[PDB]
Amino acid sequence: QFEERHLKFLQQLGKGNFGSVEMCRYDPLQDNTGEVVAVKKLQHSTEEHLRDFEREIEILKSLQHDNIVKYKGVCYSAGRRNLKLIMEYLPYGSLRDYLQKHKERIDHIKLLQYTSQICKGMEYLGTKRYIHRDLATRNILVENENRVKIGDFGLTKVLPQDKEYYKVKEPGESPIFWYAPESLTESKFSVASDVWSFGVVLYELFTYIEKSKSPPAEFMRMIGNDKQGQMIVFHLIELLKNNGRLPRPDGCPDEIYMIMTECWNNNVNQRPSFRDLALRVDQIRDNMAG
Ligand SMILES: c1cc2c(ncc3ncn(C4CCNCC4)c32)[nH]1
Numbered sequence: 001q002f003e004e005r006h007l008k009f010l011q012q013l014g015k016g017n018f019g020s021v022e023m024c025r026y027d028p029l030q031d032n033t034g035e036v037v038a039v040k041k042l043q044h045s046t047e048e049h050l051r052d053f054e055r056e057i058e059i060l061k062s063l064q065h066d067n068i069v070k071y072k073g074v075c076y077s078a079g080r081r082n083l084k085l086i087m088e089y090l091p092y093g094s095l096r097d098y099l100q101k102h103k104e105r106i107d108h109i110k111l112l113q114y115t116s117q118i119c120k121g122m123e124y125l126g127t128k129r130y131i132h133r134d135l136a137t138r139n140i141l142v143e144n145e146n147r148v149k150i151g152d153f154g155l156t157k158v159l160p161q162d163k164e165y166y167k168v169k170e171p172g173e174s175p176i177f178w179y180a181p182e183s184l185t186e187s188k189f190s191v192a193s194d195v196w197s198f199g200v201v202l203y204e205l206f207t208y209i210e211k212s213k214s215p216p217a218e219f220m221r222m223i224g225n226d227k228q229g230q231m232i233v234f235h236l237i238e239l240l241k242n243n244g245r246l247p248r249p250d251g252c253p254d255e256i257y258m259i260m261t262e263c264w265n266n267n268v269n270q271r272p273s274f275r276d277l278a279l280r281v282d283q284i285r286d287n288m289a290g
Contacts, residue, residue, distance in 0.1 A: 002026065002075035002086050007039065013093070014138075016154055017173060018044040019053075023089055037072055040085040050083065052154075057085050059130060060153050067121030069141055069151040090151065092142035096209055099137065103208040108253070111205045112285045114140075114148045116278050121150045122198065123274035126191045129159040131166055133189050135197035136178060137204045157189060165190040176233060177215040181240045181266055184233060195271045199263025206249040206256065218246050240266065255284060 006028040013021040019042055027034035042049055060071045070088040092098050095114065099106065118140065125132060133155040141151035157166045165188045180196035182188040200215055207213040220227070222244055223235040245264055248257040259280060265271045272280075 002073050002084075003028070004075055004077055004082075004084075006030075006034070007075065008034075010036065013038060016043075016152075018042060018049055019154060026086075036089045038087040038089045039075070040087065042083065045082075050081075053083055053085070055158075056153050056156065057083075059156050059158070060085070060087070062128065063124070065121055065124045066147070067117045067149050068124065069149045087151075090141040090143050090149070092144065094138050094151070095140035095142050095148055096137040096204070098142040099205065100209045106208075108206075108251075108256075109285060109288050112281055112288070113146065115202060115205065116281045116285070117148050118150065118198070118201065119274045119278035119281065122194060123278065125150075125156075126194075126274060131157045131159060131189045131191065132194050132197075133157060134175065134178075135194055135201055136175065137201055137209070140201075159190075165193075176236060177219050180268075181237060182268060184237050184240075190268070191274075192268045192271045195263050195274065195277070198274075198277070199260045200246070202256070202260050202263070203246050203249060206252040208249075210250075213249060215246060240264075 006026055008025045008027055010023040010025055013023050015021075019040055021038055021040045023036060024039050025032070025034050025036050042053055057071075057074060060069075063071070069090070072086040072088055075084040075086060076082055122132065122135070132150070132153070134152065139150065139152045140148050142148055155170075157168060159166055165182075167187050168189065169187045176184060178197045178200045180193040182190075183193050183196075203215065211217070219236060219239070220232075223232065223239060227235055243266070245261060248254070259272075259277065262272055263277075
């Protein structure tokens with residue numbers, strides 16, 4: 001129930017293939033005492049893209065969890081229906097940027113804490129048969145030193161009643177370096193495809209986001225940087241098909257790297273569950289404690 005006139009633009013928080021997110025202050029009193037919120041809108045507003053957004057809004061409105069970014073509401077001139085999603089604003093921003101800025105403060109124990117939180121949110125999603133389909137550190141938000149949330153659901157899809165995967169091919173650019181093989185080859189997205197991406201997220205975390213060590217770089221290094229266009233995808237597939245994998249990050253413990261590789265099983269059903277992951281991560285943490 002947000003009125004556009006009282007939305008004061010502060011800054012840009014991010015961009016998407018066809019969306020963006022702004023930091024705004026909602027100040028109806030025009031006394032500058034309103035809260036600061038996050039606003040997502042569309043850049044390309046095709047009837048198709050609207051359908052998706054409306055669905056994204058529904059999905060988010062339907063989620064209630066400590067590790068999921070809070071839906072605050074919607075706004076639209078009515079008007080040509082210039083739809084806008086209002087979410088809570090997280091002051092520490094994306095886990096990706098945070099992690100980078102504070103590598104010196106954040107130890108492995110702490111990475112495991114966030115890791116575990118992510119699993120709990122992912123598990124909550126799978127509960128509603130939602131496939132996230134864009135798991136990444138950019139897309140995790142930091143609410144405070146001790147808590148993260150999943151903060152974007154632009155690509156999230158709901159599973160059909162009678163199937164455990166969803167087939168979908170997206171126009172233009174895909175985060176292929178986070179994509180599971182069946183996603184690359186069949187455009188198949190399942191909880192298990194989400195676990196594959198989680199593995200990469202875990203990887204991201206333990207690279208502390210050093211640029212030379214990113215998935216795209218590490219894979220391109222592995223494929224050879226002469227590759228371009230479609231060819232990149234094709235080599236990527238061949239590479240994974242032959243058990244090529246991202247390397248253990250500098251300083252990563254073997255037990256942690258093992259979790260990553262279990263996530264990066266070619267064999268879809270041999271990938272762990274989010275509940276399993278959380279338990280194993282938590283067990284590990286406990287062992288770190290003493
Ligand atoms: C909602 C998003 C959101 C937020 N609060 C702070 C954020 N910083 C970056 N983001 C991005 C925007 C681009 N997509 C990933 C999240 C933030 N609240």
